[PDB]
Design a protein around this ligand. Structure first.
Ligand SMILES: Cc1cc2nc3c(=O)[nH]c(=O)nc-3n(C[C@H](O)[C@H](O)[C@H](O)COP(=O)(O)OP(=O)(O)OC[C@H]3O[C@@H](n4cnc5c(N)ncnc54)[C@H](O)[C@@H]3O)c2cc1C
Ligand SMILES: CCCCCCCCCCCCO[C@@H]1O[C@H](CO)[C@@H](O[C@H]2O[C@H](CO)[C@@H](O)[C@H](O)[C@H]2O)[C@H](O)[C@H]1O
Ligand SMILES: Cc1cc2nc3c(=O)[nH]c(=O)nc-3n(C[C@H](O)[C@H](O)[C@H](O)CO)c2cc1C
Ligand code: FES
Ligand code: FES
Lengths: 387, 198, 204, 408, 446, 251
């Protein structure tokens, strides 16, 4: 296929003009390097989804009632058919199968439905199909609960691609994050398939909360795994033995991938440091002033980090080059606003348990204002004849 | 002092006039091309609200409130005409003062008073002050915070529209349609402050 | 003849060409009944204010012109408000602030200042009716879409059986919130300037 | 009913108080004072008028008026004045016409200047003597099928001071003219009878002003000769009103009285030793003949010159005797004509086709340095565009291409 | 003194050996018309005309008075014109040794001359085209003056020659040229160089400044940014060291000095070195029998800001002091965008080539990718030492905005001042063309 | 001259517009008040179980069957006053007839309480068979208002209706659901020790309970608000003493 032959082979083009020798990096390698960095998080997310599902299933049902439940759900009987087991003694392979039967359909739906619009726009406007949709598709597929209906995933990727990105010009022409604008579509439009106690562990009939909702109710004494009856420790949330959105759960794996993409100079350590600074400052302020009726006022800086999608968005979605600031001094303010707003929506906003898509979507509107401030400080230096 | 800071930050962020109530959306979407003009317009709107809301509070409490002038009569069917006349008169006199006495400030901000002479932003601010039944200090703080929030929103839209000089918009959307979509995404972003009760 | 009435629908549309009149379109289009009542009210006010300002156009002094025009318009809108509260009380509660915001609505004042001041009594009523027709066209399109996809109803009649009352449809949540009106009007402008490409704006 | 009267009185008092407060703040905050506009830094003779007004109108009433052709609107862009201290802004309509290079020097179009404070100007010296006249039409004969060669005489035998290429302005009061009185001879009556323009009639209810380029070079004293084309409605839209000023000029006959106003001009010839190439067509014969006769009789220059005129047929050519005489007397001047489509009655033995193609093929295709001569051009906009494209494709700069488009 | 922190010393194979060895005799020279910014010529010679050295060949229409004279004596053999009859080169077949001789002076009389006499001699000789204003990098009008004349006595382009190795032969001419420039300057004269020593001018106008670091630093734009920031009100001139040598030789001996010492080097040059050559020589005859066989690309100047030498442009430029020959890369490699690059160069760290320090690369003329949109990952800030916002300026150039580019600092740059930003672009943009279009707009309108 | 003409035009236009406006506004006051009362009257008739279609039918059935009263909250007994035109919101906002609830007493997050509350008695002749209590509390997005119709036993509920809630239309706006509001008929409010017993059970209430109501699914933060509403308005600070009196008898 000639249209698919653009991905395998290099273009084989020469330089026509000013700089007869070019660098070796392109946008294809950049996007594939960012795509390969979410693989540890993806695989641990599949493993965790399978393990949480099996544990919660063996909590409620046991005996001949597991038979009627695993024979009524195609994920369960397909795992048992391919070879896995749904008993309590399932290994690490039977859990990755069960997590794959949830991640792979969502990823395929997102990829196909988003690529359709990508190709349609780039074909009407007479362009080559631009990479950088791989990143959007894989990120949208891993910031979602294990139990989305596929039609909602299709609607969300449609909104994220068309409205947020492709209606402005395409890759490198927008101002907003496409993946977090497709999840804000699904969050505020269909709000019960992406919130509550019934959407985050893929076990039929199991209702239980996540740890940023058990902290809001009781604090550090309420963190407990109802499927097993044990206290959620710090190393559980750090490693990622907790329920939540498919890939957000493993801070260790996210750190491993982000260290790679930050060493290579693709992601911005300035933005990452700004996010960390803002989070630490605001969380310490809240810990200092304190509150009696609010239990999120005493969550320290090292608990905000390992819970929710802070490390998934600090590392992979805040560092989006097109939506961030374009100045070295504006990137610090961008990250600081992101962290401050995340901690603020976590603590003093009662309706939303976390606030990272909504903290980044807010800072995406004020990044150009930080750019304007910095460049207008620069322009006055030039008029004084010192720059 | 906690009751007046809460009102200020609420009017600035939790209830933005331009992105929550959508008051003044023609000047908002029309004058959002340059941050300089947007800044001047936001300053003019701040001044006009700060002057207009407390004066209308005084006039209402003195004349237009039920049982305020004669025990048994209700003159609230004059709220609309009274408010709009006061707003127009104040704006025109402010423009004339700034023109004759301070042309430096006139060129700066007094040029945008003809646009906000009869604007939905100020009239909606007064109509909301009437519903909320504020005191004089609360009216002052509410007007000031509302003006600051409107200025913030319009300056952010202008900055985005200047960032969009690199964009490639379909011909049918270039102009108004992409501005409408941009403002919609801005409101979607500002929905972070929904559940906050301040 | 009727060209003056039928032009603003698609040719020179207020909300889609001359930005005048956006706040009510964004606010009251969550329900088709409120959208229709607001359409009728704006037609009424624009037409009558045009007629009266054109009748007295020659004696209005330029020094206090704004006061006179705003007085006429505010009187019209106050009468309309006192009539809505007495006969349509369920819709006035839903239109509370934007019933009175017709005074500062830009369509009314623009058609009073631009056309009515330098024209004839009868054609001013006609221009008001035309501008109200275009404004109501936009309102009713956006309201149709938002009320059909956000709640499954039209004017209060269940067209799509919701999933609570044993139905197949699950309503959209954004169609009752802020950004949906912006998106709908933007794609409406797209679809308009695709068929009438003389309205497309210059490149740079 | 005790609240109806109260509400009525309250409404009346509120509105009256607002109106009175506005009027009082108006009476204390408006200057209502004079303004002393000095047209030049040196003289004491300044212009003291009321504040509210436009600069061009004030200057015209004062007695120093610039060549405002479009009569307001900035369509022509000719009310160019230079302010050194005045209105501190450039309104976008004028900012289009004035580049960054001139706008910095304080220049502005006079039409949309806002006179609100004391402003001082710097005007050129050729505007002070711009006095009008009361002329008498000698003849209005027909030299082309659609062009009337008007000839005006200045009273007291006073030749107007102008340069080859200038243009007077002509005033026409409100009047009505029928196409029945237009005098066309049986030579040109053919296309008239074919198209039925005789059904047309004008309608002007306000005095208007237009510009017309003189066809006489200065040494021909006491004459103002024009070459006026008829501004007939296009052959596609016959219901549109016809050419006001053109119809009036065609209505002018022998012996009548007409008023012309001042010598103007920007399309002038450069003073160098480089070859000159005139490319005229249609009604653009007036400035071309002025330039050629000037350069050949008044200055007696030796620069190599050439004239290239286009025509729809051999009946459209005029001034041919004068140009043949010039080419016979002088060795520098050599001219050539080219017809678009000839007729068999003319027995044409010469160049055919469009004038840009004729010039390119016969002269410019083999010329050594097509970029070293100056090109003066005036004619229809299609011919203008075609010739400019041909010269730019042969590699000629815009500084040498000096054209004059008759109002776009 | 001034230590540049951000930049890029490009590791490319074929660094020359700084030893001046004589070069192949040349038979044709030429003046390249498309290299003088904003120049429209008035030809004075026709094909077949015998010329003398320093005899006028054409003048400028947009710059009255400036003459472009012949580098050698011979016979005009070709006048290559291209699309819309744009002049490309005026070739001259070398024959004879006649010339035009000017007035002579001594070392004592050179520092107290008149600006008018100096201008007449320079313009009549043709060395006036060695000067370049800022902004717009045009030849100065013969009636203008500038308070800052910048001598560029350092070269940091890849594979470039060493100014010291050349100046240690013409020390006397160099000092005399500095004296002439100090008499011409009306302000000061800035000799920007490296740490090492140079011949010195005793005048108090001449000042030696030292610059250190990687290369955005052998450029006159860095020197102007750090010593005399330019705008529309303040223009500064620019000249290099061999042209100062030529000015000194002119004002000492009377006759024009058209010798050069270029550095012929590159990845595919059999033996890189410095070849003593003539001014405006032919590259096809300068490089023959000295290149590895294959499909190569000859360049007049560096590989960052240099002209391809094909057909009518195959002659040494006016402001170019080196030749760079390198192969042509046209082969499509399977998954080449994904192979771990042990032999690939990048300013990022996504290849394995950065771990091997001091490694050198045999680079070719490939764009290692296709044309995309600018996703800014911060590569322009790594190679921009000046006090500007790189990505915002670059986006204001790509967008087509002239006012905002001028505000952000586009009047301080030349096409060579964005060569590294063109180098490190993932979207394969070419910013010299965009900057030149912006400067043409600014100069034309306004 | 000019000033006189401006004054004359302004005054004439102002008199005309003022006559028209002040005539239109004063002639519709009674109809506006009647329309404002019709809404609450119809909602109360819906809670009481009386079917009424048409405004005239609503007015007739309300004036026949319902009987508004005024109740003191501290002593829990009727008081003498204009019951048909009482405005409890103004009475709670006014610092004369309202008490400020401290943080330990404000279970429902209302911050104020009017001393005199209005209740309605559903009569058929002279005997009283029900009583409709207006209760309210705070939920996630807005203050929710309800009508609870408890029987003359003081314990058994006969119906319930949320007429002003303002919450997400499909998660927590299901307080207006018919299938959720039908779970209240037959429910008892107090235990044998006369303490509040209504419980909104998270996860579903046991089939056939006496004090168990299903919680809203996906909305635990509006269910908490309903539970707090009832915890307040069934305690000592709300309808506690009045409900004790009703249980003792005499209604
Ligand atoms: C410096 C200068 C020198 C000039 N010298 C000459 C000269 O020597 N000779 C010469 O003949 N002209 C000359 N002109 C052109 C000058 O403008 C003429 O007067 C021109 O012929 C217009 O004449 P008019 O006023 O009668 O036309 P107008 O009345 O101004 O215009 C009528 C024309 O426009 C069309 N038209 C009118 N109204 C409408 C409408 N509502 N919609 C559509 N189309 C409409 C008509 O069909 C007709 O073609 C010169 C112009 C300039 C600026
Ligand atoms: C990326 C690596 C760099 C990060 C460097 C570490 C930055 C730390 C800066 C804050 C230092 C103090 O750290 C902060 O102290 C607070 C109190 O002040 C402690 O907080 C603890 O005590 C407070 C006292 O009221 C309790 O309310 C709170 O619930 C409990 O967690 C936490 O341990 C931590 O949140
Ligand atoms: C470090 C890096 C981070 C990125 N993060 C995102 C992201 O969070 N969401 C998304 O849709 N695309 C992301 N992209 C892809 C690309 O930047 C995105 O399409 C831009 O927003 C262009 O519209 C990223 C790319 C890079 C190089
Ligand atoms: S500006 Fe037109 S409605 Fe507010
Ligand atoms: S009046 Fe002629 S240009 Fe404005």
């Amino acid at each position: 296929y000639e249209a698919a032959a653009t991905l395998f082979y290099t273009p084989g083009l020469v330089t026509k003009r000013s700089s007869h020798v070019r660098d070796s990096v392109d946008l294809k390698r950049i996007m594939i390097m960012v795509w390969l960095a979410v693989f540890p998080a993806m695989f641990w997310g599949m493993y965790n989804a399978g393990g949480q599902a099996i544990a919660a299933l063996n909590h409620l049902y046991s005996g001949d009632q597991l038979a009627a439940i695993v024979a009524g759900n195609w994920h369960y009987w397909l795992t048992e058919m391919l070879g896995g087991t749904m008993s309590s003694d399932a290994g690490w392979g039977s859990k990755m199968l069960l997590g794959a039967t949830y991640f792979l359909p969502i990823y395929a739906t997102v990829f196909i439905v988003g690529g359709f619009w990508e190709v349609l726009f780039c074909m009407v406007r007479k362009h080559e199909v631009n990479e950088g949709f791989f990143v959007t598709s894989i990120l949208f597929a891993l910031i979602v609960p294990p139990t989305l209906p596929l039609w909602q995933a299709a609607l969300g990727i449609t909104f994220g691609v068309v409205v947020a990105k492709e209606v402005f010009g395409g890759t490198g022409r927008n101002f907003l994050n496409p993946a977090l604008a497709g999840r804000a579509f699904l969050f505020f439009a269909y709000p019960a398939q992406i919130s509550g106690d019934l959407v985050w562990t893929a076990a039929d009939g199991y209702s239980g909360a996540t740890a940023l909702s058990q902290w809001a109710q009781g604090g550090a004494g309420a963190l407990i795994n109802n499927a097993t009856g044990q206290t959620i420790t710090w190393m559980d949330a750090f490693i990622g033995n907790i329920p939540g959105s498919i890939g957000e759960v493993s801070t260790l794996a996210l750190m491993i991938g982000a260290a790679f993409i930050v060493y290579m100079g693709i992601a911005s350590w300035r933005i990452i440091g700004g996010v960390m600074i803002g989070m630490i400052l605001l969380s310490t302020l809240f810990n200092v002033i304190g509150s009696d009726t609010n239990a999120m006022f005493n969550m320290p800086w090292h608990w905000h980090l390992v819970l929710g999608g802070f490390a998934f968005g600090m590392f992979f979605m805040a560092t989006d080059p097109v939506s961030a600031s374009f100045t070295n001094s504006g990137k610090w303010a961008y990250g600081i606003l992101i962290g401050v707003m995340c901690v603020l929506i976590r603590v003093v906003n009662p309706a939303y348990p976390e606030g990272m898509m909504l903290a980044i979507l807010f800072a995406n509107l004020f990044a150009p204002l930080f750019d304007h401030v910095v460049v207008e400080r620069n322009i006055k230096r030039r008029l004084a004849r010192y720059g | 002092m906690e009751h007046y800071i809460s009102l200020l930050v609420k009017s600035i962020f939790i209830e933005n006039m331009a992105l929550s109530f959508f008051l003044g959306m023609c000047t908002f979407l029309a004058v959002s091309k340059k941050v300089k003009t947007s800044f001047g317009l936001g300053i003019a709107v701040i001044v006009v609200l700060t002057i207009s809301v407390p004066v209308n509070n005084l006039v209402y409490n003195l004349v237009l409130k039920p049982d305020a002038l004669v025990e048994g009569v209700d003159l609230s069917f004059l709220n609309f005409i009274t408010f709009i006349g006061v707003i127009a008169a104040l704006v025109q006199i402010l423009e004339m003062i700034l023109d004759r006495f301070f042309p430096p400030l006139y060129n700066a901000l007094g040029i945008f008073l003809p646009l906000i002479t009869v604007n939905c932003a100020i009239f909606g601010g007064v109509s909301f002050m009437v519903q909320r039944d504020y005191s004089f200090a609360e009216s002052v703080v509410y007007g000031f915070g509302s003006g600051v929030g409107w200025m913030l929103a319009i300056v952010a839209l202008a900055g985005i529209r200047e960032k969009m000089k690199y964009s490639d918009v379909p011909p049918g959307l270039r102009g108004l349609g992409i501005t409408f979509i941009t403002a919609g995404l801005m409101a979607l972003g500002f929905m972070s402050f929904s559940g906050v009760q301040l | 003849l009727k060209k003056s009435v039928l032009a603003p629908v698609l040719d020179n549309n207020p909300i889609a060409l001359q930005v005048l009149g956006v706040c009510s379109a964004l606010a009251v289009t969550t329900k088709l009944e409120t959208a229709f009542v607001m359409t009728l009210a704006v037609m009424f006010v624009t037409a009558l204010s045009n007629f009266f300002v054109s009748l007295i156009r020659n004696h209005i002094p330029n020094s206090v012109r704004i006061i006179v025009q705003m007085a006429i318009i505010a009187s019209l809108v106050i009468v309309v408000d006192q009539i809505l509260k007495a006969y349509l009380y369920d819709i006035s509660k839903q239109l509370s602030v934007f019933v009175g915001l017709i005074i500062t609505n830009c369509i009314v004042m623009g058609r009073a200042e631009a056309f009515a001041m330098k024209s004839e009594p009868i054609p001013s009523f006609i221009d008001g009716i035309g501008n109200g027709l275009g404004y109501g066209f936009v309102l009713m399109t956006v309201g149709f879409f938002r009320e059909l996809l956000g709640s499954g109803k039209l004017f209060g009649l269940e067209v799509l059986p919701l999933i609570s009352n044993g139905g197949w449809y699950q309503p959209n949540g954004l169609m009752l919130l802020a950004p949906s009106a912006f998106f709908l009007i933007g794609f409406m402008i797209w679809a308009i300037r695709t068929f009438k490409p003389e309205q497309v704006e210059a490149k740079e | 009913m005790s609240t109806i009267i109260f509400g009525v009185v309250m409404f009346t008092l509120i509105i009256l108080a607002l109106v009175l407060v506005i009027l009082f703040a108006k009476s204390k905050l408006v200057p209502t004072g004079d303004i002393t506009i000095s047209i030049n830094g040196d003289p004491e003779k300044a212009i003291v008028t009321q504040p509210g007004g436009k600069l061009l109108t004030a200057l015209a009433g004062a007695g120093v008026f610039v060549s405002s052709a479009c009569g307001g609107g900035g369509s022509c862009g000719q009310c160019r004045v230079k302010i050194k201290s005045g209105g501190g802004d450039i309104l976008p309509t004028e900012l289009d016409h004035i580049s960054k290079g001139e706008a910095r020097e304080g220049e502005r179009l006079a039409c949309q200047v806002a006179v609100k404070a004391d402003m001082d100007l710097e005007l050129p010296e050729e505007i002070f003597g711009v006095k009008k006249w009361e002329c008498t039409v000698i003849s209005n004969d027909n030299k082309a099928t659609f062009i009337k060669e008007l000839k005006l005489a200045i009273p007291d035998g006073e030749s107007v001071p102008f340069r080859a290429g200038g243009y007077i302005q002509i005033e026409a009061p409100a009047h009505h003219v029928k196409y029945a009185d237009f005098d066309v001879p049986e030579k040109y009556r053919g296309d008239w009878d074919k198209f039925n323009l005789f059904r047309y009639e004008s309608k002007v209810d306000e005095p208007i002003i237009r510009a017309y380029s003189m066809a006489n070079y200065p040494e021909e004293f006491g004459i103002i000769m024009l070459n006026v084309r008829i501004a007939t409605p296009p052959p596609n839209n016959p219901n549109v009103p016809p050419g006001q000023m053109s119809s009036y000029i065609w209505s002018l006959k022998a012996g009548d009285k007409c008023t012309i106003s001042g010598p103007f001009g920007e399309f002038f010839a450069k003073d160098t030793d480089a070859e000159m190439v005139f490319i005229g067509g249609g009604a653009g014969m007036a400035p071309m003949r002025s330039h050629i006769f000037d350069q050949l009789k008044r200055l007696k220059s030796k620069r190599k010159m050439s004239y290239w005129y286009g025509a729809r047929s051999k009946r459209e050519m005029f001034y041919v005797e004068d140009f043949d005489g010039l080419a016979a007397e002088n060795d520098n001047f050599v001219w050539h004509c080219a017809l678009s489509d000839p007729q068999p009655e003319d027995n044409w033995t010469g160049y055919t086709g469009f004038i840009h193609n004729v010039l390119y093929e016969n002269y410019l295709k083999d010329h050594e340095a097509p970029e070293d001569c100056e090109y003066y051009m005036c004619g229809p906009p299609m011919m203008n565009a075609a010739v400019i494209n041909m010269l730019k494709n042969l590699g000629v700069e815009e500084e040498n291409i000096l054209l004059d488009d008759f109002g776009g | 003194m001034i230590t540049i922190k951000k930049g890029l010393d490009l590791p490319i194979a074929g660094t020359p050996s700084q030893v001046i060895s004589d070069g192949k005799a040349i038979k044709k020279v030429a003046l390249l018309g498309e290299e003088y910014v904003g120049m429209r010529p008035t030809m004075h010679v026709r094909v077949g005309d015998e010329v003398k050295k320093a005899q006028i060949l054409f003048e400028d229409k947009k710059n009255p008075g400036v003459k472009f004279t012949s580098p050698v004596s011979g016979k005009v053999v070709e006048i290559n014109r291209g699309a819309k009859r744009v002049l490309q080169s005026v070739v001259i077949e070398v024959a004879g040794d006649d010339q035009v001789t000017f007035d002579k002076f001594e070392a004592n009389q050179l520092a107290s001359l008149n600006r008018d006499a100096i201008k007449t001699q320079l313009v009549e000789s043709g060395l006036w085209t060695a000067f370049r204003t800022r902004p717009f990098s045009k030849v100065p009008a013969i009636d203008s003056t500038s308070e800052a004349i910048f001598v560029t006595a350092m070269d940091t382009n890849p594979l470039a020659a060493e100014p010291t190795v050349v100046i240690n032969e013409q020390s006397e001419a160099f000092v005399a040229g500095l004296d002439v420039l100090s008499a011409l300057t009306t302000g000061k004269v800035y000799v920007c160089k490296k740490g090492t020593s140079l011949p010195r001018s005793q005048q108090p106008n001449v000042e030696e400044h030292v610059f250190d670091g990687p290369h955005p630093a052998g450029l006159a734009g860095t020197h102007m940014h750090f010593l005399y920031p330019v705008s529309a009100d303040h223009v500064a001139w620019s000249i290099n060291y061999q042209d100062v040598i030529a000015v000194g030789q002119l004002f000492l001996t009377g006759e024009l000095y058209t010798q050069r010492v270029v550095s012929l080097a590159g990845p595919v040059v059999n033996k890189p070195r410095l070849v003593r050559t003539v001014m405006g020589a032919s590259l096809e005859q300068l490089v023959d029998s000295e290149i590895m066989p294959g499909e190569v690309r000859i360049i007049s100047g560096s590989v960052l800001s240099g002209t391809k030498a094909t057909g009518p442009h195959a002659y040494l430029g006016r402001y170019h002091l080196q030749v760079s020959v390198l192969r042509e890369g046209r082969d499509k490699e399977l998954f080449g965008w994904a192979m771990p690059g042990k032999n690939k160069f990048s300013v990022t760290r996504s290849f394995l080539g950065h771990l091997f320090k001091g490694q050198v690369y045999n680079m070719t003329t490939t764009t290692n990718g296709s044309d995309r949109s600018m996703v800014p990952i911060g590569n322009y800030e790594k190679v921009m030492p000046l006090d500007m916002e790189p990505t915002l300026l670059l986006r204001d150039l790509c967008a087509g905005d002239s006012d905002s580019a001028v505000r952000l600092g586009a009047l301080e740059l030349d096409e060579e001042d964005l060569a590294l930003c063109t180098f490190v672009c993932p979207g394969k943009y070419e910013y010299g063309q965009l900057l030149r279009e912006c400067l043409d707009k600014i100069e034309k309108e306004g | 001259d000019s000033i006189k003409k401006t004054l004359f035009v302004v005054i004439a236009l102002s008199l005309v517009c003022s006559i028209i406006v002040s005539a239109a506004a004063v002639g519709l006051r009674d109809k506006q008040k009647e329309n404002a009362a019709l809404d609450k009257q119809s909602k109360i008739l819906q809670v009481a179980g009386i079917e009424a279609k048409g405004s005239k039918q609503i007015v007739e059935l309300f004036n026949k069957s319902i009987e508004p009263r005024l109740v003191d909250f501290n002593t829990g007994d009727f008081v003498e006053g204009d019951a048909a035109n009482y405005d409890q919101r103004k009475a709670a906002k006014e610092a004369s007839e309202s008490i400020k609830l401290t943080a330990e007493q404000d279970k429902a997050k209302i911050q104020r309480r009017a001393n005199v509350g209005v209740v309605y008695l559903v009569k058929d002749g002279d005997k009283t068979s029900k009583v409709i209590l207006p209760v309210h509390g705070n939920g996630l997005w807005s203050m929710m208002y309800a009508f609870v119709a408890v029987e003359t036993d003081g314990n058994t509920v006969s119906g319930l209706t949320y007429y002003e809630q303002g919450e997400t239309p499909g998660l927590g706006g299901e307080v207006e659901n018919p299938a959720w509001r039908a779970q209240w008929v037959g429910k008892k409010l107090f235990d044998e020790n006369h303490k509040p017993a209504i419980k909104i059970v998270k996860g579903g209430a046991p089939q056939g309970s006496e004090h168990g109501v299903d919680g809203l699914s996906g909305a635990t933060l509006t269910s908490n608000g309903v539970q707090n509403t009832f915890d307040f308005w069934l305690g000592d600070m709300g309808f506690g003493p009045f409900l004790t009196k009703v249980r003792d008898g005499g209604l």
